[PDB]
Amino acid sequence: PGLEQLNASPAIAGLMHQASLLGINASISPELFNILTEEITEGNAEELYKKNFGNIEPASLAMPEYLKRYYNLSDEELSQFIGKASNFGQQEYSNNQLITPVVNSSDGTVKVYRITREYTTNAYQMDVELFPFGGENYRLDYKFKNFYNASYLSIKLNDKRELVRTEGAPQVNIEYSANITLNTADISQPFEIGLTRVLPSGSWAYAAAKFTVEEYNQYSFLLKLNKAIRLSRATELSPTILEGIVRSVNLQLDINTDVLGKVFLTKYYMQRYAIHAETALILCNAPISQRSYDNQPSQFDRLFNTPLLNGQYFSTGDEEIDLNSGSTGDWRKTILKRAFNIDDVSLFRLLKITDHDNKDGKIKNNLKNLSNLYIGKLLADIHQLTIDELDLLLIAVGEGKTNLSAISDKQLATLIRKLNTITSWLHTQKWSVFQLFIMTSTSYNKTLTPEIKNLLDTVYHGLQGFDKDKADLLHVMAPYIAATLQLSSENVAHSVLLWADKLQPGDGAMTAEKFWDWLNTKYTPGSSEAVETQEHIVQYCQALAQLEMVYHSTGINENAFRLFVTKPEMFGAATGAAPAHDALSLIMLTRFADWVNALGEKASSVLAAFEANSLTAEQLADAMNLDANLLLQASIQAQNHQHLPPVTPENAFSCWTSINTILQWVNVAQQLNVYAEDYEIPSSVSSRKDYGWGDYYLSMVYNGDIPTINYKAASSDLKIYISPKLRIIHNGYEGQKRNQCNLMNKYGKLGDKFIVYTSLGVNPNNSSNKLMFYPVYQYSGNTSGLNQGRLLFHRDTTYPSKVEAWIPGAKRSLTNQNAAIGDDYATDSLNKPDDLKQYIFMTDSKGTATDVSGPVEINTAISPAKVQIIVKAGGKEQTFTADKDVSIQPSPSFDEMNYQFNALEIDGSGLNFINNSASIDVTFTAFAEDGRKLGYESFSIPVTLKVS
């Protein structure tokens, strides 16, 4: 739980990137990872919508009740993603963005508007807002702060195009509204609405905001909203809280890996520590978010001014604040005092941890400094450390020369990690930070202690004439120094000497040899004055105390300790490099010792095996009494992930560093433990009784069913309710029509209007192919670029060729050079649509030729309204129009169109019954813009009555 062991064993965790780590505590599936990652553009919007959403139209999804129901989210949770909405059209900015759906009753369309506001000028002296009332007409709300005594005010879209001008001089605290119109050309670019007020002498004061207005198709909008929502449910954070994180971290409204990483770091910080979301964010290295959202006070005011000294923290960034300890400054210093719960002195130490460079206690008051001091204090706070402990521990890890200052985000994160790992470790071990500090750090403060004077005298008289040949130096040396040290045996001391020599602790690299030389040469006992080098020798002194602690602190088998000191190489050391003193290393020695003791008596065999290459896994297995394969797969597992010492199968068993890593694989795994007088009706009726083609046979209605039939019985009367859905598709059974239609779909959108050709033939002469081009001529229409016309064609021939279309009437030929294999268009210059009415001769210069006949003009436009449903029961036919009946109407798309009829009421009796059964005719039909019927598919719904 909480993934504590994953935190405990950094080696195992090290294999994986934090990004994956997120998967455990906060819910984000690999695919969800993908859903977050995909980029959303307006072009992409439709497909990604098909991607992210099913058949549902965005008009259906946009309804607020529908979302709540679908997501199973509370109204508040829903309100967090989407700007709040009133009963009225009025909507307001929430989290510095406006999100407004706008539907026009005329069109029957759903369009979602999103506006971005960013202040270029002022932000004081100005407040401007923009609301979309409808297409092309917007309401502008602007209020004035600051004073300007102007003759008139001009609201300008750009330097040129003033939206509004006022003869009166604007006054204080009055938001004034003026209706303004913005064009589609205007909307496309994020424009700057600038309010300039001119007073005779000023002459003017200027304040302006940059608005980004985005039009969203129903589909894409839901997608982007989707990411906002999925984030909030899974991470379990507020959409505003996330908003701060995203807005803070990267470009507006984009969810990135870094952003996820930040959500994760915070969650981890808050899971492990009492810390609330806002404080954990700063731990994550963030700046205090000054914004106020959700009717909550900003992170900053809540952080600093929940209590009141008697002043609201301005956080201006202008004010110089006296942080030194030893001075009484502004109330601002007092502000800091209540917030952190610190004295002036300790605050000074805080500032110093924040910035070593800052000579006097003065602060810029910007966000960076506030974040830096707070970082120092929280750095102390999350772990169980006072500022003293945080200071020693920072110097001990070795970091604190280094200041928070401007520090790499990468480095702040590293610092966070180191602190987290060690703190959890000390916490487990029952060791204080100071105890750790005395042992870790290379400090060794220079002083002639009585203890030191005594060691030296004994050793000095002891070592004075030493002959290397006669005896081992360490051996001879061991009892002298041990004698000085309290309760250390000769062996313990000898092990210590080895470690000291390997470590070389000091600003001056030190060796016992260096040490002895200095002693003989320079040192005199009982003399106060001495060579400055002494600081370095003092280094030796504290260092020995240090090394000794490692042995006692870790609790290592003494022989094993000698082994580590004598051959750190086995422990994965550089073997040429000094035995490591790090946090990573100290834990390593400790885990190694515990392991040795666990081995117990057998440990001699193991450690001995350890001296040579003889120790292996599965040998290790017998000792641990774990299954051999467990160790072996630990090894495989080690080999696959990347580690500080790399791990290879040859090596998995022979070198110790791999062994320690493999064992951690073990720790992780073990942790996971791994009569009739109603209608005696048929119980349904949906079979294609008949299917009919469009009038022209160009388009048709593909099979889609009338889901069920219901009925209510009355005296002589019958009420039957039906739910038939309509489908319109443009594809032929097969042939040229499909090709032409494919061209229309590929090259153009729905309602567009254009000419297609009925009869295509191969030319006698000029043709080897018996193959023909499939032409269609597009017009300027709903979606047309510059051109009046474009000639579209589909060519079967694989080989590259030029296609030319010649017109006898026109006497001009549209040309395409090296047309694409599948489909291509020859643009028309000095385009006249009338020309294309005339007979066209199309050919490849190479073997293909075709002659086109029977030109037809077609209008693809179908209002959902024009399409109908017809019914035959009894004497009278019944009809139902789409506008009333179609709940949501489909966006014009060439690909397909679906129409939904809510429910329809139908006649019965009459419908005369034959063979005691009768059917109710239901036929779906449609009519396009040019005036042909797209097709129709007729259905039957049978009914049975009494029996004669």
PDB file of N, CA and C in Angstrom, residues 790-874:
ATOM      1  N   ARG A 790     -13.379  23.142 -60.292  1.00  0.00           N
ATOM      2  CA  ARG A 790     -12.277  22.217 -60.282  1.00  0.00           C
ATOM      3  C   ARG A 790     -12.743  20.970 -60.971  1.00  0.00           C
ATOM      4  N   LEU A 791     -11.877  20.336 -61.788  1.00  0.00           N
ATOM      5  CA  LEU A 791     -12.313  19.144 -62.460  1.00  0.00           C
ATOM      6  C   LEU A 791     -11.716  17.947 -61.788  1.00  0.00           C
ATOM      7  N   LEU A 792     -12.588  17.049 -61.283  1.00  0.00           N
ATOM      8  CA  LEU A 792     -12.154  15.896 -60.537  1.00  0.00           C
ATOM      9  C   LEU A 792     -12.255  14.681 -61.403  1.00  0.00           C
ATOM     10  N   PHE A 793     -11.270  13.764 -61.282  1.00  0.00           N
ATOM     11  CA  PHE A 793     -11.354  12.556 -62.052  1.00  0.00           C
ATOM     12  C   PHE A 793     -10.693  11.418 -61.331  1.00  0.00           C
ATOM     13  N   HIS A 794     -11.166  10.185 -61.620  1.00  0.00           N
ATOM     14  CA  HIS A 794     -10.655   8.961 -61.057  1.00  0.00           C
ATOM     15  C   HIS A 794     -10.115   8.142 -62.186  1.00  0.00           C
ATOM     16  N   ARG A 795      -8.855   7.669 -62.048  1.00  0.00           N
ATOM     17  CA  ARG A 795      -8.226   6.936 -63.110  1.00  0.00           C
ATOM     18  C   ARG A 795      -7.783   5.593 -62.602  1.00  0.00           C
ATOM     19  N   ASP A 796      -8.196   4.527 -63.323  1.00  0.00           N
ATOM     20  CA  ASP A 796      -7.897   3.154 -63.000  1.00  0.00           C
ATOM     21  C   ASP A 796      -6.464   2.819 -63.280  1.00  0.00           C
ATOM     22  N   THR A 797      -5.905   3.395 -64.356  1.00  0.00           N
ATOM     23  CA  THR A 797      -4.590   3.073 -64.835  1.00  0.00           C
ATOM     24  C   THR A 797      -3.560   3.352 -63.784  1.00  0.00           C
ATOM     25  N   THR A 798      -2.657   2.377 -63.556  1.00  0.00           N
ATOM     26  CA  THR A 798      -1.607   2.480 -62.577  1.00  0.00           C
ATOM     27  C   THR A 798      -0.487   3.393 -63.003  1.00  0.00           C
ATOM     28  N   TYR A 799      -0.010   3.274 -64.263  1.00  0.00           N
ATOM     29  CA  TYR A 799       1.171   3.989 -64.677  1.00  0.00           C
ATOM     30  C   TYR A 799       0.930   5.468 -64.676  1.00  0.00           C
ATOM     31  N   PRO A 800       1.990   6.203 -64.432  1.00  0.00           N
ATOM     32  CA  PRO A 800       1.903   7.639 -64.389  1.00  0.00           C
ATOM     33  C   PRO A 800       1.601   8.211 -65.736  1.00  0.00           C
ATOM     34  N   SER A 801       0.724   9.238 -65.807  1.00  0.00           N
ATOM     35  CA  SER A 801       0.357   9.804 -67.075  1.00  0.00           C
ATOM     36  C   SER A 801      -0.159  11.195 -66.860  1.00  0.00           C
ATOM     37  N   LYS A 802      -0.399  11.904 -67.982  1.00  0.00           N
ATOM     38  CA  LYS A 802      -0.982  13.216 -67.941  1.00  0.00           C
ATOM     39  C   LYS A 802      -2.380  13.046 -68.440  1.00  0.00           C
ATOM     40  N   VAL A 803      -3.365  13.678 -67.771  1.00  0.00           N
ATOM     41  CA  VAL A 803      -4.722  13.563 -68.236  1.00  0.00           C
ATOM     42  C   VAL A 803      -5.190  14.891 -68.741  1.00  0.00           C
ATOM     43  N   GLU A 804      -5.819  14.885 -69.933  1.00  0.00           N
ATOM     44  CA  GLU A 804      -6.265  16.105 -70.539  1.00  0.00           C
ATOM     45  C   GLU A 804      -7.727  15.988 -70.841  1.00  0.00           C
ATOM     46  N   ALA A 805      -8.492  17.070 -70.565  1.00  0.00           N
ATOM     47  CA  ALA A 805      -9.896  17.092 -70.874  1.00  0.00           C
ATOM     48  C   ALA A 805     -10.118  18.187 -71.875  1.00  0.00           C
ATOM     49  N   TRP A 806     -10.661  17.839 -73.062  1.00  0.00           N
ATOM     50  CA  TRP A 806     -10.820  18.817 -74.102  1.00  0.00           C
ATOM     51  C   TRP A 806     -12.282  19.050 -74.349  1.00  0.00           C
ATOM     52  N   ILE A 807     -12.649  20.316 -74.646  1.00  0.00           N
ATOM     53  CA  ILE A 807     -14.025  20.653 -74.879  1.00  0.00           C
ATOM     54  C   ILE A 807     -14.138  21.248 -76.251  1.00  0.00           C
ATOM     55  N   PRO A 808     -15.005  20.699 -77.062  1.00  0.00           N
ATOM     56  CA  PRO A 808     -15.210  21.238 -78.377  1.00  0.00           C
ATOM     57  C   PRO A 808     -15.840  22.591 -78.345  1.00  0.00           C
ATOM     58  N   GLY A 809     -16.835  22.798 -77.460  1.00  0.00           N
ATOM     59  CA  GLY A 809     -17.509  24.064 -77.426  1.00  0.00           C
ATOM     60  C   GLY A 809     -16.560  25.121 -76.966  1.00  0.00           C
ATOM     61  N   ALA A 810     -15.843  24.827 -75.864  1.00  0.00           N
ATOM     62  CA  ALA A 810     -14.899  25.722 -75.256  1.00  0.00           C
ATOM     63  C   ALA A 810     -13.682  25.896 -76.113  1.00  0.00           C
ATOM     64  N   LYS A 811     -13.222  24.804 -76.754  1.00  0.00           N
ATOM     65  CA  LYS A 811     -12.023  24.855 -77.545  1.00  0.00           C
ATOM     66  C   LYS A 811     -10.852  25.041 -76.625  1.00  0.00           C
ATOM     67  N   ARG A 812     -11.003  24.656 -75.338  1.00  0.00           N
ATOM     68  CA  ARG A 812      -9.928  24.778 -74.388  1.00  0.00           C
ATOM     69  C   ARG A 812      -9.819  23.451 -73.697  1.00  0.00           C
ATOM     70  N   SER A 813      -8.622  23.104 -73.172  1.00  0.00           N
ATOM     71  CA  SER A 813      -8.521  21.836 -72.503  1.00  0.00           C
ATOM     72  C   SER A 813      -7.972  22.023 -71.119  1.00  0.00           C
ATOM     73  N   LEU A 814      -8.653  21.423 -70.115  1.00  0.00           N
ATOM     74  CA  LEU A 814      -8.172  21.455 -68.760  1.00  0.00           C
ATOM     75  C   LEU A 814      -7.057  20.463 -68.716  1.00  0.00           C
ATOM     76  N   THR A 815      -5.944  20.792 -68.033  1.00  0.00           N
ATOM     77  CA  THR A 815      -4.849  19.870 -68.108  1.00  0.00           C
ATOM     78  C   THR A 815      -4.381  19.465 -66.751  1.00  0.00           C
ATOM     79  N   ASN A 816      -3.888  18.211 -66.677  1.00  0.00           N
ATOM     80  CA  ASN A 816      -3.296  17.682 -65.488  1.00  0.00           C
ATOM     81  C   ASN A 816      -2.025  17.019 -65.922  1.00  0.00           C
ATOM     82  N   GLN A 817      -0.891  17.400 -65.306  1.00  0.00           N
ATOM     83  CA  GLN A 817       0.366  16.823 -65.684  1.00  0.00           C
ATOM     84  C   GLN A 817       0.747  15.873 -64.593  1.00  0.00           C
ATOM     85  N   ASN A 818       1.134  14.638 -64.968  1.00  0.00           N
ATOM     86  CA  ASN A 818       1.541  13.641 -64.020  1.00  0.00           C
ATOM     87  C   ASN A 818       0.526  13.530 -62.919  1.00  0.00           C
ATOM     88  N   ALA A 819      -0.736  13.223 -63.277  1.00  0.00           N
ATOM     89  CA  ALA A 819      -1.788  13.095 -62.307  1.00  0.00           C
ATOM     90  C   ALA A 819      -1.490  11.913 -61.430  1.00  0.00           C
ATOM     91  N   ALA A 820      -2.017  11.944 -60.188  1.00  0.00           N
ATOM     92  CA  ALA A 820      -1.787  10.924 -59.200  1.00  0.00           C
ATOM     93  C   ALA A 820      -2.408   9.644 -59.655  1.00  0.00           C
ATOM     94  N   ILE A 821      -1.952   8.514 -59.082  1.00  0.00           N
ATOM     95  CA  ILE A 821      -2.454   7.249 -59.521  1.00  0.00           C
ATOM     96  C   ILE A 821      -3.911   7.076 -59.193  1.00  0.00           C
ATOM     97  N   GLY A 822      -4.301   7.216 -57.908  1.00  0.00           N
ATOM     98  CA  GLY A 822      -5.668   6.936 -57.548  1.00  0.00           C
ATOM     99  C   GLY A 822      -6.671   7.955 -58.013  1.00  0.00           C
ATOM    100  N   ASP A 823      -6.484   9.240 -57.642  1.00  0.00           N
ATOM    101  CA  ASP A 823      -7.482  10.236 -57.944  1.00  0.00           C
ATOM    102  C   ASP A 823      -6.793  11.564 -58.034  1.00  0.00           C
ATOM    103  N   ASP A 824      -7.311  12.498 -58.866  1.00  0.00           N
ATOM    104  CA  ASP A 824      -6.647  13.770 -58.924  1.00  0.00           C
ATOM    105  C   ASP A 824      -7.576  14.809 -59.483  1.00  0.00           C
ATOM    106  N   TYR A 825      -7.232  16.107 -59.296  1.00  0.00           N
ATOM    107  CA  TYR A 825      -8.080  17.135 -59.831  1.00  0.00           C
ATOM    108  C   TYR A 825      -7.298  18.085 -60.689  1.00  0.00           C
ATOM    109  N   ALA A 826      -7.908  18.491 -61.822  1.00  0.00           N
ATOM    110  CA  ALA A 826      -7.307  19.460 -62.691  1.00  0.00           C
ATOM    111  C   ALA A 826      -8.043  20.738 -62.438  1.00  0.00           C
ATOM    112  N   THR A 827      -7.350  21.738 -61.857  1.00  0.00           N
ATOM    113  CA  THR A 827      -7.975  22.975 -61.500  1.00  0.00           C
ATOM    114  C   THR A 827      -8.298  23.724 -62.747  1.00  0.00           C
ATOM    115  N   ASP A 828      -9.308  24.610 -62.662  1.00  0.00           N
ATOM    116  CA  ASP A 828      -9.708  25.311 -63.844  1.00  0.00           C
ATOM    117  C   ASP A 828      -9.384  26.765 -63.689  1.00  0.00           C
ATOM    118  N   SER A 829      -8.698  27.342 -64.701  1.00  0.00           N
ATOM    119  CA  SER A 829      -8.349  28.731 -64.641  1.00  0.00           C
ATOM    120  C   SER A 829      -9.251  29.461 -65.591  1.00  0.00           C
ATOM    121  N   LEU A 830      -9.664  30.695 -65.220  1.00  0.00           N
ATOM    122  CA  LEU A 830     -10.575  31.445 -66.040  1.00  0.00           C
ATOM    123  C   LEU A 830     -11.766  30.569 -66.235  1.00  0.00           C
ATOM    124  N   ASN A 831     -12.174  29.959 -65.117  1.00  0.00           N
ATOM    125  CA  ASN A 831     -13.184  28.957 -64.963  1.00  0.00           C
ATOM    126  C   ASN A 831     -14.570  29.441 -65.292  1.00  0.00           C
ATOM    127  N   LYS A 832     -15.277  28.685 -66.168  1.00  0.00           N
ATOM    128  CA  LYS A 832     -16.659  28.937 -66.487  1.00  0.00           C
ATOM    129  C   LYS A 832     -17.374  27.622 -66.336  1.00  0.00           C
ATOM    130  N   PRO A 833     -18.319  27.536 -65.434  1.00  0.00           N
ATOM    131  CA  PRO A 833     -19.034  26.297 -65.230  1.00  0.00           C
ATOM    132  C   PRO A 833     -19.872  25.892 -66.406  1.00  0.00           C
ATOM    133  N   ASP A 834     -20.285  26.852 -67.250  1.00  0.00           N
ATOM    134  CA  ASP A 834     -21.126  26.549 -68.369  1.00  0.00           C
ATOM    135  C   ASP A 834     -20.379  25.677 -69.333  1.00  0.00           C
ATOM    136  N   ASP A 835     -19.047  25.845 -69.415  1.00  0.00           N
ATOM    137  CA  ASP A 835     -18.251  25.133 -70.377  1.00  0.00           C
ATOM    138  C   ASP A 835     -18.368  23.654 -70.171  1.00  0.00           C
ATOM    139  N   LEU A 836     -18.320  23.220 -68.907  1.00  0.00           N
ATOM    140  CA  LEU A 836     -18.301  21.835 -68.540  1.00  0.00           C
ATOM    141  C   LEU A 836     -19.594  21.152 -68.842  1.00  0.00           C
ATOM    142  N   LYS A 837     -20.635  21.937 -69.177  1.00  0.00           N
ATOM    143  CA  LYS A 837     -21.856  21.348 -69.646  1.00  0.00           C
ATOM    144  C   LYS A 837     -21.595  20.673 -70.968  1.00  0.00           C
ATOM    145  N   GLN A 838     -20.733  21.273 -71.815  1.00  0.00           N
ATOM    146  CA  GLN A 838     -20.483  20.765 -73.138  1.00  0.00           C
ATOM    147  C   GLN A 838     -19.782  19.430 -73.074  1.00  0.00           C
ATOM    148  N   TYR A 839     -19.808  18.691 -74.208  1.00  0.00           N
ATOM    149  CA  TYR A 839     -19.221  17.386 -74.372  1.00  0.00           C
ATOM    150  C   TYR A 839     -17.750  17.433 -74.073  1.00  0.00           C
ATOM    151  N   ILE A 840     -17.244  16.415 -73.338  1.00  0.00           N
ATOM    152  CA  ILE A 840     -15.857  16.411 -72.947  1.00  0.00           C
ATOM    153  C   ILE A 840     -15.173  15.171 -73.450  1.00  0.00           C
ATOM    154  N   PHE A 841     -13.944  15.346 -73.978  1.00  0.00           N
ATOM    155  CA  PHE A 841     -13.139  14.266 -74.475  1.00  0.00           C
ATOM    156  C   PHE A 841     -11.983  14.160 -73.521  1.00  0.00           C
ATOM    157  N   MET A 842     -11.830  13.013 -72.828  1.00  0.00           N
ATOM    158  CA  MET A 842     -10.760  12.911 -71.872  1.00  0.00           C
ATOM    159  C   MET A 842      -9.815  11.827 -72.290  1.00  0.00           C
ATOM    160  N   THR A 843      -8.490  12.101 -72.235  1.00  0.00           N
ATOM    161  CA  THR A 843      -7.596  11.022 -72.561  1.00  0.00           C
ATOM    162  C   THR A 843      -6.259  11.153 -71.916  1.00  0.00           C
ATOM    163  N   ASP A 844      -5.631   9.979 -71.724  1.00  0.00           N
ATOM    164  CA  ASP A 844      -4.244   9.901 -71.379  1.00  0.00           C
ATOM    165  C   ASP A 844      -3.537  10.042 -72.685  1.00  0.00           C
ATOM    166  N   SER A 845      -2.368  10.707 -72.681  1.00  0.00           N
ATOM    167  CA  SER A 845      -1.608  10.784 -73.891  1.00  0.00           C
ATOM    168  C   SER A 845      -1.218   9.373 -74.185  1.00  0.00           C
ATOM    169  N   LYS A 846      -0.866   8.623 -73.122  1.00  0.00           N
ATOM    170  CA  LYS A 846      -0.581   7.228 -73.265  1.00  0.00           C
ATOM    171  C   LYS A 846      -1.947   6.643 -73.412  1.00  0.00           C
ATOM    172  N   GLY A 847      -2.076   5.325 -73.583  1.00  0.00           N
ATOM    173  CA  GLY A 847      -3.161   4.552 -74.140  1.00  0.00           C
ATOM    174  C   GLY A 847      -4.605   4.830 -73.753  1.00  0.00           C
ATOM    175  N   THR A 848      -4.962   5.553 -72.673  1.00  0.00           N
ATOM    176  CA  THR A 848      -6.373   5.608 -72.314  1.00  0.00           C
ATOM    177  C   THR A 848      -7.175   6.717 -72.984  1.00  0.00           C
ATOM    178  N   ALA A 849      -8.483   6.455 -73.272  1.00  0.00           N
ATOM    179  CA  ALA A 849      -9.353   7.450 -73.869  1.00  0.00           C
ATOM    180  C   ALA A 849     -10.784   7.215 -73.441  1.00  0.00           C
ATOM    181  N   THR A 850     -11.574   8.306 -73.231  1.00  0.00           N
ATOM    182  CA  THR A 850     -12.960   8.174 -72.853  1.00  0.00           C
ATOM    183  C   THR A 850     -13.723   9.397 -73.291  1.00  0.00           C
ATOM    184  N   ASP A 851     -15.015   9.215 -73.636  1.00  0.00           N
ATOM    185  CA  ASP A 851     -15.860  10.304 -74.046  1.00  0.00           C
ATOM    186  C   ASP A 851     -16.995  10.398 -73.069  1.00  0.00           C
ATOM    187  N   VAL A 852     -17.264  11.617 -72.550  1.00  0.00           N
ATOM    188  CA  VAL A 852     -18.278  11.810 -71.546  1.00  0.00           C
ATOM    189  C   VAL A 852     -19.544  12.364 -72.123  1.00  0.00           C
ATOM    190  N   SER A 853     -20.689  11.853 -71.615  1.00  0.00           N
ATOM    191  CA  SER A 853     -21.973  12.275 -72.098  1.00  0.00           C
ATOM    192  C   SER A 853     -22.932  12.358 -70.945  1.00  0.00           C
ATOM    193  N   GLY A 854     -24.072  13.050 -71.170  1.00  0.00           N
ATOM    194  CA  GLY A 854     -25.149  13.127 -70.217  1.00  0.00           C
ATOM    195  C   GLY A 854     -24.774  13.894 -68.980  1.00  0.00           C
ATOM    196  N   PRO A 855     -24.245  15.082 -69.100  1.00  0.00           N
ATOM    197  CA  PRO A 855     -23.890  15.868 -67.945  1.00  0.00           C
ATOM    198  C   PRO A 855     -25.113  16.128 -67.108  1.00  0.00           C
ATOM    199  N   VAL A 856     -24.973  16.162 -65.762  1.00  0.00           N
ATOM    200  CA  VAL A 856     -26.080  16.448 -64.881  1.00  0.00           C
ATOM    201  C   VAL A 856     -25.622  17.353 -63.779  1.00  0.00           C
ATOM    202  N   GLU A 857     -26.498  18.294 -63.363  1.00  0.00           N
ATOM    203  CA  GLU A 857     -26.153  19.172 -62.283  1.00  0.00           C
ATOM    204  C   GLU A 857     -26.818  18.637 -61.060  1.00  0.00           C
ATOM    205  N   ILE A 858     -26.047  18.549 -59.960  1.00  0.00           N
ATOM    206  CA  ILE A 858     -26.567  17.960 -58.762  1.00  0.00           C
ATOM    207  C   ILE A 858     -26.327  18.874 -57.606  1.00  0.00           C
ATOM    208  N   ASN A 859     -27.315  18.944 -56.691  1.00  0.00           N
ATOM    209  CA  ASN A 859     -27.143  19.674 -55.466  1.00  0.00           C
ATOM    210  C   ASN A 859     -27.240  18.648 -54.373  1.00  0.00           C
ATOM    211  N   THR A 860     -26.133  18.439 -53.649  1.00  0.00           N
ATOM    212  CA  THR A 860     -25.997  17.465 -52.597  1.00  0.00           C
ATOM    213  C   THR A 860     -26.798  17.871 -51.396  1.00  0.00           C
ATOM    214  N   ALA A 861     -27.118  19.174 -51.277  1.00  0.00           N
ATOM    215  CA  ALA A 861     -27.733  19.674 -50.081  1.00  0.00           C
ATOM    216  C   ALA A 861     -29.008  18.951 -49.787  1.00  0.00           C
ATOM    217  N   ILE A 862     -29.139  18.486 -48.531  1.00  0.00           N
ATOM    218  CA  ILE A 862     -30.336  17.836 -48.094  1.00  0.00           C
ATOM    219  C   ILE A 862     -30.662  18.438 -46.781  1.00  0.00           C
ATOM    220  N   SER A 863     -31.772  19.138 -46.624  1.00  0.00           N
ATOM    221  CA  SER A 863     -31.873  19.533 -45.259  1.00  0.00           C
ATOM    222  C   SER A 863     -32.384  18.327 -44.539  1.00  0.00           C
ATOM    223  N   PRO A 864     -32.085  18.170 -43.282  1.00  0.00           N
ATOM    224  CA  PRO A 864     -32.611  17.033 -42.595  1.00  0.00           C
ATOM    225  C   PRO A 864     -34.090  17.172 -42.631  1.00  0.00           C
ATOM    226  N   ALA A 865     -34.579  18.417 -42.768  1.00  0.00           N
ATOM    227  CA  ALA A 865     -35.973  18.748 -42.840  1.00  0.00           C
ATOM    228  C   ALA A 865     -36.633  18.209 -44.082  1.00  0.00           C
ATOM    229  N   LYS A 866     -35.956  18.279 -45.241  1.00  0.00           N
ATOM    230  CA  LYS A 866     -36.558  17.868 -46.486  1.00  0.00           C
ATOM    231  C   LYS A 866     -36.825  16.386 -46.500  1.00  0.00           C
ATOM    232  N   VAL A 867     -35.941  15.584 -45.880  1.00  0.00           N
ATOM    233  CA  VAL A 867     -36.076  14.145 -45.863  1.00  0.00           C
ATOM    234  C   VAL A 867     -37.297  13.756 -45.049  1.00  0.00           C
ATOM    235  N   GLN A 868     -38.034  12.683 -45.445  1.00  0.00           N
ATOM    236  CA  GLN A 868     -39.291  12.409 -44.781  1.00  0.00           C
ATOM    237  C   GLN A 868     -39.437  10.978 -44.333  1.00  0.00           C
ATOM    238  N   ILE A 869     -40.609  10.694 -43.704  1.00  0.00           N
ATOM    239  CA  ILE A 869     -41.064   9.368 -43.370  1.00  0.00           C
ATOM    240  C   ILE A 869     -42.516   9.325 -43.777  1.00  0.00           C
ATOM    241  N   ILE A 870     -42.974   8.208 -44.402  1.00  0.00           N
ATOM    242  CA  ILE A 870     -44.340   8.087 -44.878  1.00  0.00           C
ATOM    243  C   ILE A 870     -44.956   6.811 -44.335  1.00  0.00           C
ATOM    244  N   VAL A 871     -46.284   6.807 -44.023  1.00  0.00           N
ATOM    245  CA  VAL A 871     -46.902   5.621 -43.462  1.00  0.00           C
ATOM    246  C   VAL A 871     -48.236   5.315 -44.093  1.00  0.00           C
ATOM    247  N   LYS A 872     -48.539   4.004 -44.240  1.00  0.00           N
ATOM    248  CA  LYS A 872     -49.776   3.594 -44.848  1.00  0.00           C
ATOM    249  C   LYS A 872     -50.487   2.627 -43.955  1.00  0.00           C
ATOM    250  N   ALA A 873     -51.516   3.106 -43.237  1.00  0.00           N
ATOM    251  CA  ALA A 873     -52.381   2.211 -42.532  1.00  0.00           C
ATOM    252  C   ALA A 873     -53.746   2.747 -42.822  1.00  0.00           C
ATOM    253  N   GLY A 874     -54.686   1.877 -43.242  1.00  0.00           N
ATOM    254  CA  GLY A 874     -56.040   2.300 -43.478  1.00  0.00           C
ATOM    255  C   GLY A 874     -56.173   3.040 -44.777  1.00  0.00           C
TER     256      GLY A 874
END
